[PDB]
Amino acid sequence: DRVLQLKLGNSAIVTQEAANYCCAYGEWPNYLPDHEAVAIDKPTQPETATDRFYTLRSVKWEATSTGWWWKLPDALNNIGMFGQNVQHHYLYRSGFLIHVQCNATKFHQGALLVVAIPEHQRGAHNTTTSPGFDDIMKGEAGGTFNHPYVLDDGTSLACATIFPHQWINLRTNNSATIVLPWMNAAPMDFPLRHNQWTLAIIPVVPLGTRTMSSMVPITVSIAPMCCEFNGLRHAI
Amino acid sequence: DRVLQLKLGNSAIVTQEAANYCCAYGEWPNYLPDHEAVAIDKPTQPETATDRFYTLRSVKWEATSTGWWWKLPDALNNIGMFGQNVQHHYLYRSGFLIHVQCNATKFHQGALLVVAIPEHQRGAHNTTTSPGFDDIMKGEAGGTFNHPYVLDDGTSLACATIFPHQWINLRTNNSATIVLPWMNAAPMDFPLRHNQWTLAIIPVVPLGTRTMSSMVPITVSIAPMCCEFNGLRHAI
Amino acid sequence: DRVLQLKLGNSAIVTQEAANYCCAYGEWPNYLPDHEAVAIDKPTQPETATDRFYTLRSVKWEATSTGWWWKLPDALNNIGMFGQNVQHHYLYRSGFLIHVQCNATKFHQGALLVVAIPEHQRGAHNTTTSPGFDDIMKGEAGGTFNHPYVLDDGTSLACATIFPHQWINLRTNNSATIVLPWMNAAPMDFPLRHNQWTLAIIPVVPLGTRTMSSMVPITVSIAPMCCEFNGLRHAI
Amino acid sequence: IESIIKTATDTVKSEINAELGVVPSLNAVETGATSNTEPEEAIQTRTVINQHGVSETLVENFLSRAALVSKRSFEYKDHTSSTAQTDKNFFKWTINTRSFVQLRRKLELFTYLRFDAEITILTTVAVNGSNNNTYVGLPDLTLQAMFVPTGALTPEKQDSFHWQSGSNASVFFKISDPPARMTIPFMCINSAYSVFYDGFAGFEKTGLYGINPADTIGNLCVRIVNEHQPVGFTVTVRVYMKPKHIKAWAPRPPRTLPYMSIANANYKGKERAPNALNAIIGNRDSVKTMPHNIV
Amino acid sequence: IESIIKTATDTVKSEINAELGVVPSLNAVETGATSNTEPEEAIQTRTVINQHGVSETLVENFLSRAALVSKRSFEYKDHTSSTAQTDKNFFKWTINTRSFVQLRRKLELFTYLRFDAEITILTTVAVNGSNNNTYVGLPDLTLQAMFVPTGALTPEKQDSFHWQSGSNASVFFKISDPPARMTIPFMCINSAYSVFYDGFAGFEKTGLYGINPADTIGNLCVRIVNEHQPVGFTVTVRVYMKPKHIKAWAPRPPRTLPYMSIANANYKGKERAPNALNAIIGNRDSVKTMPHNIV
Amino acid sequence: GVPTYLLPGSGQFLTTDDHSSAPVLPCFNPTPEMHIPGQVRNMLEVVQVESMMEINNTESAVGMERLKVDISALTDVDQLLFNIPLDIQLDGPLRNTLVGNISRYYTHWSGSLEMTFMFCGSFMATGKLILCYTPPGGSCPTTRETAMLGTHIVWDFGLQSSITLIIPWISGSHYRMFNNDAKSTNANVGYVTCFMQTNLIVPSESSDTCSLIGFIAAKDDFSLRLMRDSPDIGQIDHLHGAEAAYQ
Amino acid sequence: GVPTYLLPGSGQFLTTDDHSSAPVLPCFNPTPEMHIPGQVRNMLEVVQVESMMEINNTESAVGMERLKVDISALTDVDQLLFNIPLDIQLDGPLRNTLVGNISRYYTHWSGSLEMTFMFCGSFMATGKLILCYTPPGGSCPTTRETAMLGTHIVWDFGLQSSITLIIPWISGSHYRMFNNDAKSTNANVGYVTCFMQTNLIVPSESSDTCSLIGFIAAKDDFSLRLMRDSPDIGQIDHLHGAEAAYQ
Amino acid sequence: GVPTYLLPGSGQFLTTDDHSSAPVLPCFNPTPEMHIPGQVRNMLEVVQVE
Amino acid sequence: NQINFYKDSYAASASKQDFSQDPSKFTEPVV
Amino acid sequence: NQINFYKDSYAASASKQDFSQDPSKFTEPVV
């Protein structure tokens, strides 16, 4: 459909069958203004080094794939110079340029509500205990959805479209682009113990084709846009 | 003598018995101009994160201490966000703000030619073989001088004053400050396989005192000034 | 992709899935100016009669097809009014409008570097003897490539892109158009004993498809553009 | 078009250009080369002023390197005594680029080149050791280098009376001297030297292929002026041609395989890779296996 | 700053300057060098106009002295008969400053120098006396001096067919002639020659230390053009490089110890003073004992 | 004028001299120049055009199958497709390129490299694909997450069917040389590594041997400097016609 | 023009010639010059900076203990501390100086010498100290009253802890040479003699091995003339790598 | 002027040279030229005839 | 910088001054 | 006084005319 080039840092993503991007909540990402700031420390603003698109582990898409989610910046907590700056700084502010490519053939019947949940407070089925570190902060590999229909938090996938979202419907869309800005109540907040954004890709319509079954990988490339960092400390 | 405050990033160094600093070769450190640049990549310029003063391992000063040297950025190759950016970038440009504090009492008789050698091509005594990695790139711990009188390269300590230098003569100088700019033939060059600066602290006059012998530590704090980084790659 | 109509003489070629044409060396074909001419004879300039697109013998494309080449005007030496004028004139000047159509389905995996070599001095493998008439001037049927990788002259296909070229990559290109002007050191030169252009179509990527194998013909239609002829003699 | 560039082009500052509807990087190969420049996409460039050397990579600077085109170590003796087609104190070198593969590859980079041949003839003497002669000094022979066009009769002897040079161009230079810096002009009846010629020289069907009749410059008949010495020397005449006044047309694939013949472009590579027929580039162990790796 | 001085600075008249509160002579070493000039204190100077030579002590005047960088007395004979790595009528001298300690010390005065190498190749012939040959005259050999950059294949024989010089820079000069005054340019990919390099050439850990990959100018392959003579000569090719167009950076301590290796700066002094490891300066009998005294 | 002293650089045939030379033909008017197409006034015009690399440098890849690379639908994600030693002089995929054969004539090379890869597949052959170029300093990557930190670009095949990655000019010096030691700061350009991003999705009727054709060109800032003699050709013996053009 | 006669100084490689020489690389554009720090456009900038002498030229002073001089609290007044042969060429304390190693390249030297001595002692280490420089013509002094008549300067240690004596330029000629005969009117610069003035007063907790570090620099009128070849290095044999860079 | 380096094309008798040559007769005034008929200033005047 | 004292224009110095070049002949040979 | 007749600016005479020099780079490298 619409060609789209996203050039930030050394990385560049060119997609030929994408739709228009998803500038989230009418807000392009920006650095902290002199009024919205709360930390006197000079921000690192390590542009180019941390605004690169970080291609994550591509998860396989099958007919029984319920869903996958990645928490930002937990998916990028240990990846690249953004991961090094996240470990080396206590305060951070970064929007995210989501680009999820699902390269499938034109004979493929499926769709992915690639949704970006702000503060996905995940729940656990049939137990009142809160999810731990191993159920929330999976990291670069991400976490799968046991129950994607309830959006794994007691809410509803049906209404997940109030969130920054596109679809990777394999009819005429192989790649989707969501432009997340910084979103938290705090202007800057701890990256390794909070997830300001949670990108979730859910096979709402599971991949289908009577054609040669081929792993339809869900290549996730999140570029942390407009990176800011305060509180330079040791590598936490 | 002269008070001096060096405030870069979150780190700040206040010394009460220092001399004037040593802005090297009449050149304050600066970023790469649009004319002197050779790498189209956008530099990281991770200011504040890498312009911090990095306090190294303080070496003990005794009566038999011949000398110690640190190679820049090999002394800062694995330290802090500058070390992370050095491992994550193939090209770098950074001046260095040397501050070496030798806190000794007023009864102490000694001096240190704290010299900053550009490209200290070290030699080895009684063998024609080139020094290896274990004789050149010691890292954060640094390397001692087996023969500091010959400046460990066949040259001469006596003439080492043509280099950016001060003295930490314990009469009226407990701290010395050398402001190294970027210095290489290349505008940007590989940090982990080249040492554009080599800071060497040599007890030209060995510590002396008939007073309580107390470890006179040679606290070395090198702040990498005006940091630039090109070629964002994996952590080498 | 791009529609393109080439209307010269009575012939017209309409292609619906072509790219932009290949006006060669930034030079549209033209007649001999009053300054570049060397032959006092009035040129024939038999436009329309010799600017027609001449559809050649279409060669079959299989998986083991190494390559095919046609020498201009040797491919058109005996075809049409251009062939009659070539036999009836000793001096000639004509650019060529190459149009090569490879009508393959959308399930077909293959590409053709349709290259136009100026003065393809062909070599012979494992012998120092020069190629004869039967190895150079094949005529309208053209000659196949025994070794297309070396471009059959000791050179390299890899670098054949310095020549007027397109690709007939069957993803989104079924027809390629190369607009050759007149190119020789002489302004006009003997057609039947010299090949000023040599159009070579090489299956760089051989046709592939798990679909119904169907002869993918390589239909070659060369229109001799801006035709000029001097030295009206008998039919050589 | 209309580019009069003398230095390398400076790159400008690039930002996050993530724009819908147009894209720089996804180009079409199937027209020609691509127009995706550095600040357009794929990188966030910095404004660097580029002052790099473009004069050193000029095509005239590329091609006005005086390289060897004929090295003849012809034996200078009383050839009369016993000699059959043995360069009797003179050789009729037909002027071809194609004898030495360095400058041959440099001129076979391009289909057409109009140039003037700055021909420098460096001549070296060596006393031949087959007769076990002593060194007895290296003589300062005046060596005539007559350039004859085609159609002019080439000489058959050292004193062949065709060395009178009533109209033929010749130089008379000694060996204890600077070499003969002579410039043969654009000696072509066409407007360029067709370095490659997809045609036959004669109008007959049995003509030799690939030799342009326009590019037959002629023969460079080089002789010894003075008479034969009792001690035999091996006069090695090396003619070096500097393509001067370079105007090149239609750049080509360079010749990857080793050359075989002067008259044609016949090919046979090495027995394995590199520069072989079935493998021009030296093979790796696998497609993903990477050679020359720092570990 | 902004000093365009051409002559030595004149001193002004000094008076009794015994002033309280400021002092010129008591300076601080622990910043740098001192600013106590002659009329400021410690002497009552006189106004003398200073017209002394500063052009002779310019850094270009210091460094554009053509000194030796490679002396190869390679044996010129029919090396074919019997020769193993014996300079078969040609040597592939990799261009390094570091072979001869005079100009090596002159260029190792400075960390960085951008310069053009005016390379003068003076070649001398000597008849070798191991075979007890007679003098029989010194021949006027034309001697090719081909400069190959790095990456280009160095030749392996005298007639190695890499002496064609299609793009390689070479000079063809005889010995009964002025020497080859050739200028190799600033052949560095960086903006200066890093005469000292605190780094490794390769990205691997086992790379050789101190050799800048930017400063690999290449090899200066020098050969004999003509074929082997029956009498053997010892051709001694001395290449002298005059650092021309001098721009020097970061002056250094001069090398006091005798040099050991070309590739590195490994050191071992003389067995006693002077220029020893434990004593660079020759020792006196005592601290107050004064040598070279008129009595 | 009359007082003339000979320089040390006299009587020397400097192959690279430009001194004017005696006209052998004395009033020779040359041929009038016609407007031939394709005048190359600078070799950097030849290098700025596309040229295939031989990605399959493989003994099984004989002849035609060296330029193309047969990638398939692998069942594992983040898989390495191929790595290109971006070494122009070290007889790598590039050597046989118009940016590489011409730069093998030059000791010094500089400027940003173009890296244009086309997809020679079917129209229904879809899938994103990522071209990671990493600056030198470490090993060549074999996994996606350690290679996406460098200069990478994601390529959906789409309609234009060809991406153009741009290698940026990262070097400490102004000109990377061809020191014949790939592992040299002054010689290594880096590694271009190609990975699956969302896997090659192909239908049943399309072949599962879909092919990538890459090209490396130069940009308008590319520059070659010290001219050497390309090691591509080798005259170990005299060619045919030698001792016969002499006749 | 055409009538040219060869001078007697033709065909001579004068090592110190400046004649233009043939460019080996013919259209070679060099690397663009960046603003590297520390450009030295004149060696007299190198000599104008401080450089330690080796005051202890003593067999007991091995290695590090040569630059410093261990002075103590002597019980006698007017005592000689050390004498420096101000001979740059006669391998004296100066030879190993940036004013001395560079002037060992030059036969002629001129200009006022800087003589800066710092005190590497404790803060409580006090005592005046006198740096007598005497012009040549007599013997080197050993007592204070015969040396204070020359260029002397009294140095209380104080706070700045370093004096800068200035050697004045006293010579009959305009340039003292390095004739290798220290005792030559045209070669001797004089003698710098150091004496106790009010003795080194040190407390009990401070060491009675207080140390002086001297430097000799040049002034802005200093000048070196005829350039010779420094006798510091000696190539009695070929270095390592010779017969190997040749390979 | 004084700094002169010899070219590779020195000491060569290029038969087709045009370099000025020393006058053997030093103040030799030649014969005055009369208007002889049939001056051929170009051979292409000879070839243009039958 | 030209020492062309001969009467032929071809015999001059090697003209390394043709800095103008049109890369669009071979890079972008379209429209 | 310059006999630079070559087409390269590097091949000229040894420029012993850079009389300007800044000794404060190494003598007084302060403030």
Automatic annotation (TrEMBL), chains A, B, C:
Record localization: Host cytoplasmic vesicle membrane; Host nucleus; Virion
Annotated signal sequence range: none
Transmembrane domains' residue ranges: none
Family the UniProt entry places it in: Belongs to the picornaviruses polyprotein family.
Complexes and interactors: Interacts with RNA-directed RNA polymerase.
Function: Capsid protein VP0: Component of immature procapsids, which is cleaved into capsid proteins VP4 and VP2 after maturation. Allows the capsid to remain inactive before the maturation step.
Name of the protein this chain belongs to: Genome polyprotein
Residues of the full protein shown: 80 to 315 of 2188
UniProtKB/TrEMBL annotation, chains D, E:
Protein species of origin: Human enterovirus D68 (EV68)
Protein's name according to its UniProt entry: Genome polyprotein
Job description of the protein: Protein 2C: Induces and associates with structural rearrangements of intracellular membranes. Displays RNA-binding, nucleotide binding and NTPase activities. May play a role in virion morphogenesis and viral RNA encapsidation by interacting with the capsid protein VP3.
Localization in the cell: Host cytoplasmic vesicle membrane; Host nucleus; Virion
Assembly and oligomerization: Homohexamer; forms a hexameric ring structure with 6-fold symmetry characteristic of AAA+ ATPases. Interacts (via N-terminus) with host RTN3 (via reticulon domain); this interaction is important for viral replication. Interacts with capsid protein VP3; this interaction may be important for virion morphogenesis.
Family: Belongs to the picornaviruses polyprotein family.
TrEMBL record, chains F, G:
Domain of life: Viruses
Subcellular location: Host cytoplasmic vesicle membrane; Host nucleus; Virion
Oligomeric form and interacting partners: Interacts with protein 3CD. Interacts with capsid protein VP1 and capsid protein VP3 to form heterotrimeric protomers.
Protein family (similarity comment): Belongs to the picornaviruses polyprotein family.
Function: Protein 3A: Localizes the viral replication complex to the surface of membranous vesicles. It inhibits host cell endoplasmic reticulum-to-Golgi apparatus transport and causes the disassembly of the Golgi complex, possibly through GBF1 interaction. This would result in depletion of MHC, trail receptors and IFN receptors at the host cell surface. Protein 3AB: Localizes the viral replication complex to the surface of membranous vesicles. Together with protein 3CD binds the Cis-Active RNA Element (CRE) which is involved in RNA synthesis initiation. Acts as a cofactor to stimulate the activity of 3D polymerase, maybe through a nucleid acid chaperone activity.
Name of this protein: Genome polyprotein
Shown segment, full-protein numbering: 318 to 564 of 2188
From TrEMBL, chains I, J:
Spans through the membrane: none
Cellular location(s): Host cell; Virion
Record's signal peptide: none
Purpose: Component of immature procapsids, which is cleaved into capsid proteins VP4 and VP2 after maturation. Allows the capsid to remain inactive before the maturation step.
Family per record: Belongs to the picornaviruses polyprotein family.
Subunit structure: Interacts with capsid protein VP1 and capsid protein VP3 to form heterotrimeric protomers.
Protein name stated in the entry: Genome polyprotein
Organism whose genome encodes this protein: Human enterovirus D68
Upper taxonomic lineage: Viruses, Riboviria, Orthornavirae, Pisuviricota, Pisoniviricetes
